[PDB]
Amino acid sequence: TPQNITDLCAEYHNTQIHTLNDKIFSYTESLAGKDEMAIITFKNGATFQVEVPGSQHIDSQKKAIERMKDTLRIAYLTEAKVEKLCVWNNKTPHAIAAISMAN
Amino acid sequence: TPQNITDLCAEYHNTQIHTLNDKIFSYTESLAGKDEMAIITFKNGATFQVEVPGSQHIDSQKKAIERMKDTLRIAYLTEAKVEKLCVWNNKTPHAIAAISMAN
Amino acid sequence: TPQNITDLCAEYHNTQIHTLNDKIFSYTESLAGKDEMAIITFKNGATFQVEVPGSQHIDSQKKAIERMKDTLRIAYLTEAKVEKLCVWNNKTPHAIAAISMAN
Amino acid sequence: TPQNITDLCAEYHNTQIHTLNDKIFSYTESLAGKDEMAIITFKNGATFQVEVPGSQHIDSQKKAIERMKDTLRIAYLTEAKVEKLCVWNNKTPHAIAAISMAN
Amino acid sequence: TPQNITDLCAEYHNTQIHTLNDKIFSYTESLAGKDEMAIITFKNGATFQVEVPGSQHIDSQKKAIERMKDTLRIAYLTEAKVEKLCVWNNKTPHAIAAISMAN
Numbered sequence: 001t002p003q004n005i006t007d008l009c010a011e012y013h014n015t016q017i018h019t020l021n022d023k024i025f026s027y028t029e030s031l032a033g034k035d036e037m038a039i040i041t042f043k044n045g046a047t048f049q050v051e052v053p054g055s056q057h058i059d060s061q062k063k064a065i066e067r068m069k070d071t072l073r074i075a076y077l078t079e080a081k082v083e084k085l086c087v088w089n090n091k092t093p094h095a096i097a098a099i100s101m102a103n
Numbered sequence: 104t105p106q107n108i109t110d111l112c113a114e115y116h117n118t119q120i121h122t123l124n125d126k127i128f129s130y131t132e133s134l135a136g137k138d139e140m141a142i143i144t145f146k147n148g149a150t151f152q153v154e155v156p157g158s159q160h161i162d163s164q165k166k167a168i169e170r171m172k173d174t175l176r177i178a179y180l181t182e183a184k185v186e187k188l189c190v191w192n193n194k195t196p197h198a199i200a201a202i203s204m205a206n
Numbered sequence: 207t208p209q210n211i212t213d214l215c216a217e218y219h220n221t222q223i224h225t226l227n228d229k230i231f232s233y234t235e236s237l238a239g240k241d242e243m244a245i246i247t248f249k250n251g252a253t254f255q256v257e258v259p260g261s262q263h264i265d266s267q268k269k270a271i272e273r274m275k276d277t278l279r280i281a282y283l284t285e286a287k288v289e290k291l292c293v294w295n296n297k298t299p300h301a302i303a304a305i306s307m308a309n
Numbered sequence: 310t311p312q313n314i315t316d317l318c319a320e321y322h323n324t325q326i327h328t329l330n331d332k333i334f335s336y337t338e339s340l341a342g343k344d345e346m347a348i349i350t351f352k353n354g355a356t357f358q359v360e361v362p363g364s365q366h367i368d369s370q371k372k373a374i375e376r377m378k379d380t381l382r383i384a385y386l387t388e389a390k391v392e393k394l395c396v397w398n399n400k401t402p403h404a405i406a407a408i409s410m411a412n
Numbered sequence: 413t414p415q416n417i418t419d420l421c422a423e424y425h426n427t428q429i430h431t432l433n434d435k436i437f438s439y440t441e442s443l444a445g446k447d448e449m450a451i452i453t454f455k456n457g458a459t460f461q462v463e464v465p466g467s468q469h470i471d472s473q474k475k476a477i478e479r480m481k482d483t484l485r486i487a488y489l490t491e492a493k494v495e496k497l498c499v500w501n502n503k504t505p506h507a508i509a510a511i512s513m514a515n
Contacts, residue, residue: 004459008440008442025206031199031201032200035114036163047107064448067441077177091104098441101439103438130308131214131304131307132277132304133304135214152207176280180284231412234317235407235408236317236408238317238320238395239370242370243310245311272372297310298310334515337420337511339420341424341498348416348417382486
């Protein structure tokens with residue numbers, strides 16, 4: 001199994017790593033339908049989203065996606081420092097595939 | 104995909120942004136019949152609610168409503184500054200469609 | 207729609223508002239069969255309980271009841287000042303129907 | 310309904326109240342199959358457990374059991390003072406039936 | 413029956429207890445399909461993971477798995493000291509079986 005975020009991020013297509021080593025700057029949640037979306041930004045301006053559960057989301061991928069939203073909401077409120085983000089760049093804002101937080 | 108709440112907001116009907124830049128002043132929760140609701144108010148007098156889960160709402164929308172209540176509860180408790188709120192102005196208290204928090 | 211716990215409490219059957227403006231003094235949780243219950247008391251001796259999840263009431267009513275127990279546990283742990291409680295008087299200890307928190 | 314934990318602990322067979330008035334010293338979680346367990350200890354050496362949600366547990370029972378493990382984890386992590394524990398003294402360690410926390 | 417992470421760890425196969433007595437150094441969460449994994453690291457470099465679901469793990473095993481992920485997440489966010497880890501040494505990185513936390 002991959003030991004970290006980088007080697008984990010190289011296993012998929014259309015993914016790229018971003019080293020933020022910074023705390024989330026803003027958190028946006030929308031419950032307005034078809035856009036069950038969470039959007040975060042950092043101070044430099046970089047925006048990322050947690051992609052809405054469309055049909056390309058199994059039922060094992062719905063749970064992991066909800067978890068990701070929880071992780072971001074709490075990482076935001078606790079001001080936790082996010083290290084790197086492995087993101088799908090074929091979408092805009094870049095959809096988050098993985099996250100690592102390090103003190 | 105909208106990069107923020109202002110855009111995310113203008114995407115629906117009867118929606119309206121509301122800048123707050125204030126923490127939630129009060130949080131009310133009620134489990135009394137068909138009105139399982141949460142009400143939040145700010146120091147300036149503004150009172151918003153999270154709609155009641157029912158009829159129109161399917162599945163992904165029924166649990167986004169649950170996440171929204173969780174988000175408001177932990178935001179009230181942690182005294183997080185809510186920047187803006189996209190609210191459905193056709194309801195009273197104005198229902199919440201989206202929220203953004205910053206820093 | 208009522209815009210606060212007092213008004214909201216006025217729409218139901220034999221409910222009563224108790225103003226506390228204090229934090230919860232103790233929280234008791236019991237998983238002992240049939241009487242799955244949560245009890246809270248304030249330093250002033252007042253005692254309240256969240257009603258146990260009957261099947262005869264809808265499932266959204268069971269999710270509300272579960273949320274309420276989370277809210278009380280987290281309110282107790284963080285020492286949130288509870289403003290008012292809207293409870294049903296036809297029970298003993300009195301069953302909570304709504305709660306407001308504010309500083 | 311019982312209004313305190315000592316009353317309540319008395320409605321059952323083979324129960325026994327312990328007063329700790331102390332925080333949880335350690336917390337042990339395990340997912341190693343059929344042994345889905347939580348184990349808490351206090352400085353005085355006492356050890357308690359939350360029973361595995363077996364396939365003889367009623368509907369609500371499994372869910373109250375999940376709640377009790379969430380409570381112990383959060384109590385441990387926040388160093389919340391545990392007042393008394395109502396345990397069944399016929400298991401090793403004593404299975405927890407109810408918990409009370411007071412400042 | 414067993415009362416601590418050690419006894420409990422010695423009742424399964426391919427398990428070894430790891431004494432860490434330190435806080436988790438980094439936390440990595442991944443929602444990228446079939447790689448829905450949680451990987452933690454400690455200061456010395458030691459890496460562990462929580463085994464992704466599947467039909468090998470009964471639904472109750474899926475739940476202890478989800479619970480273990482939440483525990484790892486708040487422990488990291490709160491900087492709780494993790495004492496010992498009981499891990500399956502037959503995989504790489506070693507898969508976590510039980511965790512003990514002690515202040």
